[PDB]
Design a protein around this ligand. Structure first.
Ligand code: CA
Ligand code: CA
Ligand code: CA
Ligand code: CA
Ligand code: CA
Ligand code: CA
Ligand code: CA
Ligand code: CA
Ligand code: CA
Ligand code: CA
Lengths: 1664, 253
RNA sequence: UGAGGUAGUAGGUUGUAUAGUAGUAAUUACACAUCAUACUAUACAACCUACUACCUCUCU
């Protein structure tokens, strides 16, 4: 965006170098070396890794390491490296105590690293219980200063030198910089050779210094002598004034100003009066605070007199060029060194300049000069300059200005990082640490007085035409003459108005520095080809017809010889890695002679995660640049062959990758869906934002179902049995409970086709909890033509007059196509059983729509009260509600009341009154009982109870007042008069079952739609049964040492780097225990144009090439092979070498690299390691998870569980899909991942994620279930039987709803002819009675929920086969051709579809183990690269039976010694899916019955890379995670340091970094235990329950939450986390959260994620 | 009077027999709210009246259907809380201010106050009271939601402008001669320019065995000019000489 | 369990926002920037539902 520049990308000629540390330990692995590193932490990393590798070599026939260490044996505090060795390896390490004397019984051979002090090992080897032939490594902690050198000299000169080299171990000597040893240099070349003679090594100094020396663009060195600085009048006056004040302040008396004097005199003598005033700026700003900040009055006088001296200088300069009179103005008054810096910036006109200094005022005044001149001159418009100072304040005192300083460093180094400023005028902090862009100029201001300042800041200029310009000026000579007053020239001014010695000594200094780096490159082994070899190969790079994927087209891709190496580097830098991995191409040069010329073959090696597991043995050329280029050309041809590089020859990437199996590519659908997909402005498919309307599919047992006369139809009884009487707390009226199983008159289904078995569900009535079933009448019932008419009239009566269910628009259609079953009133028999009540049917026919007769007084006088006419009756009154009556039950016939018993109110007298007054009626029998009545039911949804809600919680009942109070107060009763009521022909008991009917019919249709799904999939893929034992019932479910230890651990971990930063000092010297080269380099510097002076401005035919490049092939053979072709195909080089190899004996090559660099550590197979000569060939029960029922013969799921899956949560029903839907979501993602691991055996898992994410998305699962039309089987609505239900045998026009004896043509003829025969607008689509809207995501939810249903009954295989039915092909196909009759019908095996075949779905194979046999003894190297993981296997309890899974899971992408497997990344991808599923399935089965949110948050707390890394460290990982990364070793070091503080428990805050690779290896061990166990989930869960079950149980009873979520919801609209800002270091970042009006709290970490997490932990423990 | 129109229609029917019946025509679950549409009917014997109505709530739709029949027979809100999250605030707290004692016709008043303003709202229920109060409070919040050395040079220029003729006399006299009295002339400049001079000769002796003096300008800055001599008086004279040098190099323009 | 109104309380759906957990990268040196890839939370809100408490008109 803003940065967007080249940043060198990657290297094109040298293979993009590996980082130096693993190269050093490569060389150390086979040579006695002396590693010259100033950083103790780097030396400690190499020592740690090297003791680890040679320890693996050691414990095979019995050896030991030693770590002779001078800083041991004084305190019993364990040393620097005892921490790292005892908490990051599995070895047992024994730093000895001060005056250690063998604690008890202490056999030394049971110790692996054995930290000692040098005289301690002299003791212990003269003790002769630690034999030298048993020692396998001797790490001289220091051998680069004279004291420990004299102390370790008795060891070598007594034991190591009188020992044959078949017994002398590796003598890794942790020296410091040989490039900082400070002995002039005239004896330097002696002493290290002396050292090499006496510690018996040879220095293999390959540092960050040297890795810029070999494998970088060497910048152009321009050591400019500037000029002598002469003085004008004004500068002479200024020198007079400051010399006067200096000589006075020598004599001023107090029985820090010399800092200002000794700084400002140097500024005057190196920059001039202008920079003297702009440093009077800095020092007077120091005095303006430090004259007030002192308490001593005479020190106050002293600082303020120096302040007035700076005022005097500033006024002198201000009165000199603004007042005596501006690029000629600054150039007049600047010293010439400033002028040469101006020419160096002017010439280099794009820039990334990195000027260096060593004092903070110097950098500030350089900033001010560049700011002024850049705002003046035309040339340097592009210089926008930003400076730096060092750390002058302290975190103890004045933290406000110290923090403002730290924010200024942060805000300067962020805007140098992209491109906002090109110029960074720094100081000594910028040498190491701080990361900068690639630089094309470093103008060093002072001479670099140390070698290390020279090299670490010249080695920052890497933008390929980079420059290194050192300015040279005469050094400071004091012109002070004494304590005199102002001079004659000073007074006249105020009243009127040796280059050669310095240049020669810097030439000798830089000749010394050149000899230092020449000795450094002398000591380095991997020598690199000179520039003329590159020029020769560049000339030679056209005699080869480049490899072409599409050779017919001259636009298509091409691999020449330069692009060969650039393409190998581009391929390996696109291979996948984490933050701490360096993925590079390894390379082994060689030489041998071939009938004349000597030829330089290569061998190649790509990263371990690459699919290319072979050694690309390159082809020889006369010059090693040319055969390097050809070896990478052979690599790129083989890359394109094997299919990494595709037909355009740039590596493939995730997006362009395509699924290989053709079923996985289809993703096709009904064309309105892709219309909406291409629209991109409606709610897109698969989401919950798009509502599609479907049809409430009446079951296929209810369509075409009505009996006609004579047709034998089945009679089902709607049996109701009360299982749970109402609690009397809810009984706010005290009515008797009425069981319905002893009621006389109930109902029956009557149907031509059988409803199959269903779940005996339960309803929740006014009288309690009832169980609704269905039972058949055995004698199939023959209807005559007459009884159909009475059942038609009865059914219109029962669902229109009694229950009032019939809507307006719908009709009764007695001869109707769909939803056409009969309901008949059943009477119990006296002996037993029921039948249809024919007498009651005749009564219903006779008593038609009889409006109740308003009885006149004759019958009221004539006939009396009857108890039997009102006991168990429905007693609707006739004096009011004449046409739409109101029906009451009868609770009791109350005898104590009467029409003369008192009126409960006071506006009337008793009950025989106010029937005359309100109505006009007269009670005749005034000696009759009365009627305690309660209303009949009018909310017919009896599917949910009303006294217990969804979570098992029982809702508040009706106290004790509103009970047995107003229960029995006569105001709050309905008491009716029996002569003022008509007994409805439907009795009360028949009214109980009749009012329960609508929800009975709804739940039977729902269980039938679910059984339709079951029979459907059992028809298609053998999965279930077609018909039949009863289904399971439908039920709903209801202090200070802590901080002391923490400070100790964090401080010593940082104190390794503090000891480095207190070691910019001098190293080795010899107390008795070149010049020609310097003169040559001096002549080179003065003569080769490197030294600018103080006045010069700064600045063949193809046959001949075929003869040269092929000198081992003569005039013959070549003449035939070339032919008339213009340029050879690469096959001709390959073929000619193949011929020569065929002719002769076995060649014996020469391994080169000056030895061991990039060899013996990586890719070596056939070597004599003594003399380094190759002989190569160019040519190759308690809740099981995996429990599966016997799926053949299985009936599939139950329709209650399928119904549960089909039931959305908008139903407000009992059952619900959601727990199945989360479990099926996780099982689907799991199973897709496992098949993608089986199938794409070489594909990088970021493309397996692409393929899985295509299979598992919401679009795919919606689209599949819509292909199966699952929207038309779902329950998505609150069932109100008066609003969205169609009673049996009625009909609805289905179109006449919206488009608005004549109503009975709509089914008969048409709809539009019926139409035209005669809040947010008004139009609404969609039909309530027979449709229901469903979101597309809800269809995907029902898809995952149905996988959940098939999962929980019929196993993992059944859920795989259900997603095979549904369309996700995630199994293999083995087709037979009518292989049977499909009577045996193994599940999976579909129809004999079209031509008579079956298409059986196969199981999952055991995949081939990832043991790469590209090396000849990979089983023995697997036995040897996993020595001692048995204690690790005991640390997790499962023995890997194919251990390359274990090594593969433990192998980081940087562990380049591994040649046998891949990295862990594919197993990490698989084991995440396995772990996610296992945790979700575990939290499903806890009897607390977690919600979706509970299970998700408890998984996110149980599965989390921080919890993963903490349980990794706690249960013993990280001592077996084999990496070779330095930074990851640092992070593991600090994190296990803290985790042993805590005893394995879970300014700016700085939490310790959580090592993400430890969480990844926690996952990858799950993936490897999965794959290694023939894909079982009860071998993964055994191990990981044994690890995380304390965490499961602890987070089960509470809620941990992530710190970020917990803060952000505990202050819910208040804890706001802000954008990250990068620090000064450039690998750290800081996050601040403002808990509003309570504080800003700050955290740091390498990345944004751990930075917000740390900031959240800061505010969390703050607000407590 | 204030009966709901569904109960008003029920009252007009219950005095004439006849109980109405409501049937739901169409519910529509759109992107942000569902609408409900009821149909109310009126007998099956003599002039069977009917109507339909709709609203975003079931009771609102039943009310609108009954109101139409009477006439025939005659959403976030928390954009406020998002805005509170924007301007770095804790969440608002509306509070139950007061209520009416009648149970079925109580009109709540609820006030919401934060650090800036206060608002309130009256509703037939307390939820719509919060909606009206939060609308008024959202309306209320959405209507009205070195240089030190140069300074020293500047006011020393001002004190120079307030000095007078002795600056130009100082410029046009060579200070090499001691025949002009340095201490006396510095005191004259003090009397001239509203300040005083200070002379400090500290009691000890140097390594050279000489005496020294510091002159302090009793003005706004701290101020020291140094001087030394073999005697105390010559040291004070040389300190006043350097003070004359200070004022001299300040003066020339 | 007439109808209405109000208060809690207990369920769920949907919207909007802030997120999280897992996965995943390629731009990018490498990261940030992710994420119509999966799951969910919180806050506010709309709605549906159940019960209780107080009422008013009924009804008795
Ligand atoms: Ca009921
Ligand atoms: Ca009712
Ligand atoms: Ca090999
Ligand atoms: Ca899913
Ligand atoms: Ca879902
Ligand atoms: Ca991972
Ligand atoms: Ca009510
Ligand atoms: Ca994505
Ligand atoms: Ca996302
Ligand atoms: Ca998503």
């Amino acid at each position: 965006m803003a940065f967007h520049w080249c940043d060198n990308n990657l290297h094109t000629t040298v293979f993009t170098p590996r980082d130096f540390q693993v190269e050093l330990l490569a060389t150390a692995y086979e040579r006695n070396t002396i590693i010259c590193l100033g950083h103790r932490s780097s030396k400690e990393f190499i020592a740690l890794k090297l003791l680890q590798e040679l320890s693996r070599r050691a414990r095979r026939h019995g050896r030991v390491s030693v770590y002779l260490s001078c800083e041991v044996g004084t305190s019993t505090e364990p040393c620097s490296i005892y921490t790292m060795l005892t908490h990051l390896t599995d070895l047992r390490v024994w730093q000895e105590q001060p005056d250690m004397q063998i604690p008890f019984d202490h056999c030394w051979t049971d110790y692996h690293v054995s930290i000692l002090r040098p005289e301690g090992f002299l003791y212990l080897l003269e003790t002769r219980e630690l034999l030298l032939s048993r020692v396998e490594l001797i790490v001289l902690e220091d051998c680069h200063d004279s004291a420990v050198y004299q102390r370790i000299r008795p060891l070598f000169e007594n034991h190591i030198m009188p020992a044959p080299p078949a017994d002398r171990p590796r003598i890794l000597g942790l020296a410091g910089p040989l490039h900082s040893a400070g002995c002039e240099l005239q004896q330097l070349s002696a002493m290290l050779a002396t050292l090499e003679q006496s510690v018996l090594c040879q220095i293999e100094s390959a540092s960050d210094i040297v890795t810029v020396l070999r494998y970088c663009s060497r910048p152009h060195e321009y050591i400019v002598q500037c000029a002598p600085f002469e003085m004008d009048e004004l500068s002479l006056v200024l020198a007079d004034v400051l010399n006067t004040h200096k000589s006075f302040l020598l004599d001023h008396r107090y029985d820090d100003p010399l800092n200002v004097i000794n700084s400002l005199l140097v500024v005057l003598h190196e920059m001039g009066p202008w920079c003297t005033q702009r440093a009077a700026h800095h020092f007077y700003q120091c005095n303006e605070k430090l004259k007030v900040k002192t308490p001593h009055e005479r020190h106050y006088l002293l600082y303020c007199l120096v302040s007035t001296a700076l005022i005097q200088l500033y006024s002198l300069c201000e009165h000199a060029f603004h007042r005596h009179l501006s690029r000629q103005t600054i150039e007049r008054y600047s010293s010439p060194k400033v002028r040469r810096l101006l020419q160096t910036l002017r010439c280099f006109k794009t820039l990334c300049a990195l000027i260096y200094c060593n004092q903070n005022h110097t950098a500030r005044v350089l900033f001010e000069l560049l700011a002024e001149i850049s705002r003046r001159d035309p040339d340097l418009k592009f210089l926008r300059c930003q400076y730096t100072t060092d750390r002058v304040a302290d975190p103890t005192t004045e933290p406000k200005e110290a923090e403002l300083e730290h924010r200024r460093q942060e805000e300067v180094l962020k805007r140098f990082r992209m491109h906002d400023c090109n110029v960074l005028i720094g100081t000594s902090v910028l040498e190491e640490g701080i990361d900068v862009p690639k630089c094309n100029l470093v103008v060093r201001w002072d001479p670099p007085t140390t070698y290390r300042s020279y090299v670490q800041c010249k080695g920052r200029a890497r933008a390929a035409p980079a420059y290194h310009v050192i300015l040279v000026a005469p050094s400071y000579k004091s012109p002070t003459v004494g304590s005199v007053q102002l001079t004659d020239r000073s007074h006249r001014y105020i009243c009127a108005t040796s280059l050669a010695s310095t240049t020669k000594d810097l030439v000798h200094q830089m000749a010394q520095y050149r000899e230092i780096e020449q000795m450094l490159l002398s000591k380095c082994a991997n020598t690199e080809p000179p520039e003329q070899e590159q020029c020769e190969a560049e000339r030679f790079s056209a005699c080869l017809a480049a490899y072409r994927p599409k050779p017919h087209l001259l636009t298509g891709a091409s691999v020449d010889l330069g692009s060969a190496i650039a393409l190998v580097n581009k391929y390996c830098a696109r291979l996948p890695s984490d933050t701490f991995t360096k993925l590079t191409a390894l390379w082994r040069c060689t030489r041998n002679e071939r009938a004349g010329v000597t030829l330089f073959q290569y061998t190649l090696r790509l990263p371990i995660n690459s699919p290319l597991k072979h050694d690309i043995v390159g082809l020889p050329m006369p010059t090693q640049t040319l055969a390097r280029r050809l070896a990478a050309l052979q690599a790129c041809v083989e890359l394109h062959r094997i299919g990494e590089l595709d037909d355009q020859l740039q590596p493939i990437g995730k997006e362009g990758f395509r699924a290989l199996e053709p079923d996985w590519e289809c993703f096709e659908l009904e064309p309105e869906d892709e219309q909406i997909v291409q629209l991109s402005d409606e709610p897109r498919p698969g989401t919950t934002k798009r509502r599609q309307y479907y049809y409430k599919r009446i079951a296929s047992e209810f369509c075409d179902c009505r009996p006609v006369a004579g047709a034998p139809c089945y009679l089902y009884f709607i049996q109701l049995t009360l299982q749970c009487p109402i609690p009397e707390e809810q009984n706010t009226r005290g009515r008797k409970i009425y069981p319905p199983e002893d009621a006389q008159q109930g109902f029956g289904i009557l149907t031509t086709k059988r409803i199959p078995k269903l779940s005996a569900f339960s309803i929740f009535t006014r009288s309690g909890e009832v169980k609704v079933s269905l039972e058949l009448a055995k004698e199939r019932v023959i209807l005559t033509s007459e009884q159909i008419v009475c059942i038609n009239g009865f059914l219109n009566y029962t669902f229109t007059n009694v229950l009032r269910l019939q809507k307006f628009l719908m009709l009764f259609d007695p001869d109707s196509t769909e939803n056409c079953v009969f309901i008949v009133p059943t009477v119990k028999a006296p002996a037993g059983g029921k039948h249809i009540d024919w007498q009651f049917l005749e009564l219903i026919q006779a008593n038609g729509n009889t409006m109740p007769r308003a009885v006149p007084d004759e019958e009221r006088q004539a006939q009396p009260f009857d108890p039997q006419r009102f006991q168990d009756a429905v007693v609707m009154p006739w004096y009011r509600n004449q046409d739409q009556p109101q029906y009451f039950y009868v609770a009791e016939i109350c005898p104590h009341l009467s029409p003369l018993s008192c009126f409960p109110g006071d506006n009337y007298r008793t009950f025989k009154h106010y029937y005359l007054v309100k109505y006009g009626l007269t009670i005749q029998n005034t000696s009759q009982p009365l009627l305690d009545v309660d209303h009949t039911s009018a909310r017919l949804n009896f599917l949910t109870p009303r006294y217990v809600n969804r979570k098992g919680v029982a809702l508040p009942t009706s106290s004790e007042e509103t009970k047995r109070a107003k229960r029995e107060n006569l105001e709050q009763k309905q008491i009716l008069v029996p002569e003022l009521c008509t007994v409805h022909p439907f009795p009360a008991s028949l009214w109980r079952t009749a009012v329960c009917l609508p929800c009975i019919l709804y739940r039977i249709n729902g269980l039938l739609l679910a059984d339709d799904i079951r029979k459907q999939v059992s028809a298609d893929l053998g999965l279930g049964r077609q018909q039949i034992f009863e289904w399971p019932m439908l039920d709903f479910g209801w202090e200070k040492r802590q901080k002391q230890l923490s400070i100790i651990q964090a401080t010593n971990a940082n104190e390794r780097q503090y000891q480095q930063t207190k070691n910019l000092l001098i190293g080795f010297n010899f107390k008795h225990e070149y010049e020609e080269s310097i003169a040559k380099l001096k002549t080179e510097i003065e003569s080769g144009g490197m030294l600018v002076p103080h006045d010069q401005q700064l600045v063949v035919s193809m046959m001949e090439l075929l003869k040269q490049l092929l000198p081992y092939v003569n005039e013959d053979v070549l003449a035939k092979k070339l032919g008339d072709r213009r340029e050879l195909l690469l096959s001709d080089l390959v073929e000619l070498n193949a011929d020569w190899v065929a002719r002769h004996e076995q060649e014996t090559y020469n391994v080169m690299g000056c030895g061991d660099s990039f060899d013996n550590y990586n890719d070596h197979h056939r070597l004599n390691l003594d003399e380094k000569q190759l002989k190569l060939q160019y040519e190759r029960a308690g809740f099981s998870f995996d429990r599966q029922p016997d799926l053949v013969g299985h009936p599939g799921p139950s329709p209650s569980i399928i119904l549960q899956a089909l039931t959305m949560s908008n139903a407000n029903d009992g059952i619900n899909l959601e727990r199945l839907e989360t479990i099926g979501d996780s099982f689907l993602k799991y199973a897709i991942t496992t098949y993608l691991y089986i199938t794409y055996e070489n594909v990088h898992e970021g493309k397996l994620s692409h393929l899985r994410s295509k299979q598992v998305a919401n679009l795919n699962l919606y689209r599949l279930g819509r292909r199966k039309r699952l929207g038309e089987y779902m329950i998505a609505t609150k069932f109100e039987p008066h609003d969205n239900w169609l009673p049996p045998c009625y009909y609805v026009p289905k179109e006449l709803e919206k488009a608005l004896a004549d109503l009975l043509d709509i089914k008969n003829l048409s709809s539009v002819q019926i139409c035209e025969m005669v809040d947010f607008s008004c139009f609404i689509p969609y039909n309530l009675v027979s449709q229901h809207s469903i979101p597309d995501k809800s269809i995907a939810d029902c898809v995952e929920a149905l996988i959940g249903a098939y999962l929980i009954e019929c196993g993992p295989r059944g859920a795989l086969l259900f997603m095979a039915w549904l369309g996700v092909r995630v199994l293999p196909i083995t087709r037979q051709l009518d292989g049977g009759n499909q009577e045996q019908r193994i599940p999976g095996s579909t129809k004999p579809n079209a031509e008579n075949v079956v298409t059986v779905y196969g199981a999952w194979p055991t995949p081939r183990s990832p043991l790469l046999h590209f090396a000849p003894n990979a089983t023995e190297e697997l036995d040897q690269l996993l020595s001692g993981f048995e204690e690790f296997e005991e640390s997790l309890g499962y023995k890997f039976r194919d251990r390359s899974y274990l090594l593969q899971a433990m192998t980081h992408a940087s562990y380049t010694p591994n040649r046998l497997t891949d990295c862990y990344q594919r197993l990490e991808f698989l084991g995440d899916a396995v772990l996610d599923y296992l945790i979700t399935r575990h939290l499903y089965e806890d009897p607390r019955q977690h919600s979706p949110g509970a299970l998700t948050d408890l998984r996110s707390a149980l599965v989390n890379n921080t919890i993963f890394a903490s349980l990794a460290v706690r249960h013993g990982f990280h001592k077996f995670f084999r990496h070779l990364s330095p930074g990851l070793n640092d992070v593991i070091d600090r994190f296990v340091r803290i985790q042993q503080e805590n005893g394995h428990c879970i300014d700016d805050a700085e939490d310790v970094e959580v090592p993400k690779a430890l969480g990844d290896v926690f996952e990858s061990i799950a993936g490897a235990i999965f794959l290694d166990s023939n894909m079982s989930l009860d071998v993964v869960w055994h191990v990981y329950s044994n690890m995380m079950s304390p965490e499961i149980e602890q987070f089960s009873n509470s809620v941990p939450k992530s710190p970020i979520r917990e803060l952000l919801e505990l202050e819910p609209e208040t804890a706001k986390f802000g954008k990250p800002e990068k620090l000064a270091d450039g690998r750290r970042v800081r996050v601040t959260v403002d808990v509003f009006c309570k504080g800003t709290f700050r955290g740091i970490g390498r990345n944004y994620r751990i930075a917000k997490c740390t900031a959240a932990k800061c505010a969390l423990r703050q607000l407590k | 009077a204030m009966k709901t129109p569904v109960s008003i229609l029920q009252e007009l029917l219950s005095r004439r027999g006849i109980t109405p019946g409501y049937e739901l025509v169409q519910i529509e679950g759109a992107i942000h709210e569902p609408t409900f549409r009821f149909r109310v009917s009126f007998k099956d014997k003599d002039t069977p009246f009917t109507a339909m109505g709709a609203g975003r709530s079931k009771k609102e739709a039943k009310h609108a259907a009954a109101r139409a029949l009477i006439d025939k027979l005659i959403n976030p809100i928390g954009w406020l809380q998002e805005m509170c999250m924007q301007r770095r605030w804790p969440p608002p707290s509306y509070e139950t201010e007061t209520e009416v004692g009648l149970p079925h016709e109580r009109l709540f008043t609820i006030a919401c106050s934060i650090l800036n303003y206060r608002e309130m709202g009256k509703g037939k229920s307390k939820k719509i009271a919060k909606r009206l109060a939060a609308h008024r409070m959202w309306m209320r919040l959405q209507e009205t939601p070195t240089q030190h050395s140069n300074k020293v040079s500047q006011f020393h220029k001002t004190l120079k402008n307030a000095t007078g003729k002795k600056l130009l006399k100082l410029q046009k006299t060579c200070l090499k001669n001691n025949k002009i009295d340095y201490i006396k002339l510095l005191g004259e400049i003090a009397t001239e320019n509203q300040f005083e001079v200070t002379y400090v000769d500290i009691e000890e002796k140097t390594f050279s065995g000489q005496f020294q003096c510091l002159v302090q300008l009793s003005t706004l800055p701290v101020g020291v000019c140094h001087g030394s001599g073999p005697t105390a008086a010559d040291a004070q004279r040389h300190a006043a000489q350097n003070a004359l040098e200070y004022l001299k190099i300040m003066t020339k323009k």
